[PDB]
């Protein structure tokens, strides 16, 4: 929280051309009734009573959250973490190769870059997260 | 999964199906399940609610988890994490709304938006670590 | 945690070593804190002080204890240019005040008497370079100077490190035939008459 | 030394740009990450008067006297100040540097971005709230900078203090030497008396050091002139006071009874009708702020202030 | 007479009330319908700093120096100020009357509203803007008033100039008589020289009138003591200047070379080590504000200010 560290962190957030930043995600409300501390039921219900009736349910995967700055020129693609951080400490080609499965899913007609929220596997290679 | 409910008692009816489905999300890969609204960003809404299966929770909370359940449940309080998850996403909307072209070391609206996010990281970091 | 918790336990420890040959006199404050007390006690508040190798200015923040009423300037040098920046960062006003930092000895022009603190600075550069510094200080208009270096005969309980003989020969070469009063004493826990840091009080 | 005595002073930062150029938005990030800084802002002063935008020429000059009184109060307190440039021109930009450079190292950041999407960020700042800024009013501003950008360097203006070379009025040295001394609050200490009711000045107290300048001034060629703002009605509680304290004097000049004009101008008028050109004043001894300015600034004489005025 | 020369002074209206009691809403109608009035408001100073409510002790302290700098600048200008009371707690409310009573006829309007109509417009307000005031912080305030309401009448309290009677320190009169004189800006007009680089001071100009005070005081028992904040390094362009003008003196005291502390505190230290107990000071002649404040306020000596300080 030292002013000079925040400042330079941000300076770098700006140079590295980062344009997004993850949220933390809350568990669903507990249900004492249903004897569970994060309740599937009470969670979707919460959305309902708040006027949201159209919802999705993905599977959360054991991995690190990363934002892929998927440049059309696949050489140019870099990664940023749950914080405002360029992911450089990885061999940019093994990374890029795994990233190419993805790359070929798009029409890149006048599209220079797609910013994509993703999980990296295993949680191992990047940070550790729970270890 | 994709669902639109319309009224809270439609929700009641399809719950047991939805409950049965996430019930199978149990393999070593999976933190559990996540619940998002169809629209990714809405006013005052959180991006998601996680609902972690008992096996994964056992890892965040420790091996005595089931034996200590009513305890932990009573201790559980998401009201603060939920607020940050909500504000956090609201920042991201604004960060994304900033044009990629304009990202740079003197976009002092971007610099503000970030400092904001950074501050809210220091806040959300003091919360119950197991959320 | 307290000095009267300590006072009650000290006899027990001393006795333990007495039947192991060793005549130990324990002190509560760490070795550094003993040093700081000795100097402050010895130098007092009456002349402005010159803190050579002042580092993080820990000696500065001691003389500015409100209790003491330091009614003088306070001169400081470190050749280490990271300290360089720190001092200049109290032209943030955080207190200039009476600080005067200098890294070039030709920028120190005060001609009235000072007291001089040279703590553990003479072994974070060479003995030839130590002589050069000490010899300079003894030329200056000073009242008391205190020089502090470890006593190597103590290192047996764990740049260069000097013995009491080695240190006393160093002071003699630097004072030469000038007319000073030179006094030695140990600082810190005293095992068989030997302490972990040794000191001089040179007086005009 | 001078090489080696260097002094440090608060910074004043001036934000020059047309509206929409990110003056505020920058300051918002600035005072949060740099350290000894308070922002002063004209608009926010308007809101105190419940004005949304530009108000009466009344409020407006008054709003200013508050703004500079604040920027200076902060600067004097060795606290750094950031402000939006006022008019964004040239000459008000000078008025600023004039007013404030005694007090701080002045520096500038210009926000010079184009007129057509200065409108595209002024027309997205003017619908969160209300407002409107015509692409006329914003247009006065973009070029007004462009001319003053052209004839003024926006690089630092280090604290310039400036001494007024003290030059006294030219007195005809042929005249006799004399010193002039005030009464109320200078030679005669009121001690709870009424300022305006000088009827009990016969029981005032004596400001000894001043008395001792007059008692010494006459032990030399000096003639001692007493010049009081006391109504002439009270002249014998006065030369009772004078006699009581061995304060001998040549000439007692006093306010016409029932005059009541402010005591600056009746003392100055007295000086010209009763003293000027007819005596030689070495120096004057007075006390009240208002009057000292008068002697010093208007008539350019040596005037020694004995205690505090500011009334 | 005196009964009929009467003077009038600006009004200060202080608005005493709980948050929600309609303090603002009154001022909005007041400064629009009454005539010579400007509002000062603390919250708005916060907004300048981009904080919505209650900030760092840092900002908050400074904001006060701004508020007071503003109320007074306005008051001095013969302009009426309406301001919200800082609290209801008697002593901050007293602190206000201290601060501003030299300057204006103070008056008060209390906004005494019952506790639950105060929440019912605090929770209709706190839907309006972002702010919030709980049903805790309102009531420390509502009852706080009902107590300080009881032990103070919100009576008008007309302008008070309190004349700190000029009382000098008590000196041993048997000691020798002496006058003390500053150099830079007092006996020596530095005239475009560097303030701090006094190496060329043998070509300064003579403040002729001060010289004629020293030249007169030495024509009596007075020892003439010069006490300059100039470095002793520059002592020989200095007694070059002095002899040049036959300004003979008994004792020249100067600043230790390489000292560099504020020039008041080295002069005070200079005064006590070298003058006190050994002399009787009739009066002193200095120039710089900081230093005259020292002499007068810290040491209670007669000090005659020769020209303008404020540097
Ligand atoms: Mg007067
Ligand atoms: Mg001066």
Residue numbers in the entry:
A (entry chain E): 2 to 132
B (entry chain E): 264 to 394
C (entry chain F): 219 to 376, 390 to 435
D (entry chain D), E (entry chain A): 2 to 312
Reported in the publication:
However, we were successful in performing structural study of a newly discovered bacterial RNA repair complex consisting of three proteins named Pnkp1, Rnl and Hen1, which form a heterohexamer in vitro. Since the newly found RNA repair system possesses elements of both T4 and Pnkp–Hen1 RNA repair systems, it can be regarded as a hybrid RNA repair system. Therefore, the Pnkp1–Rnl–Hen1 heterohexamer is likely the functional unit of a new bacterial RNA repair system in vivo. Because the Pnkp1–Rnl–Hen1 RNA heterohexamer possesses two identical copies of each enzymatic activity, a total of eight active sites are present in the complex, same as in the RNA repair complex of the Pnkp–Hen1 heterotetramer.
We crystallized the Pnkp1–Rnl–Hen1 heterohexamer and solved the structure at 3.3 Å resolution. The structure confirmed several observations from the chromatographic experiments, including the formation of Pnkp1 homodimer, Pnkp1–Rnl interaction and Rnl–Hen1 interaction. Unexpectedly, Pnkp1 and Hen1 were found to make physical contact in the structure, which was not the case with the chromatographic analysis. As a result of the additional Pnkp1–Hen1 interaction, each protein makes physical contacts with the other two proteins, resulting in the Pnkp1–Rnl–Hen1 heterotrimer adopting a ring structure. Because Pnkp1 forms a homodimer (coloured cyan and sand), the overall architecture of the Pnkp1–Rnl–Hen1 heterohexamer consists of two rhomboid-shaped ring structures of Pnkp1–Rnl–Hen1 heterotrimers fused at the Pnkp1 dimer interface. The side view of the structure displays C2 symmetry, suggesting the presence of two functional units of the RNA repair machinery having RNA substrates approach from opposite directions (indicated by arrows). On the local level, the Pnkp1 homodimer is formed by interactions between the same enzymatic domains, resulting in kinase and phosphatase dimer modules. In the structure of the Pnkp1–Rnl–Hen1 heterohexamer, however, the relative orientation of the kinase and phosphatase modules is locked at 130°. For the Pnkp1–Rnl interaction, each copy of Rnl makes contact with a single copy of Pnkp1 at the kinase domain. On the other hand, each copy of Hen1 make contacts with both copies of Pnkp1.
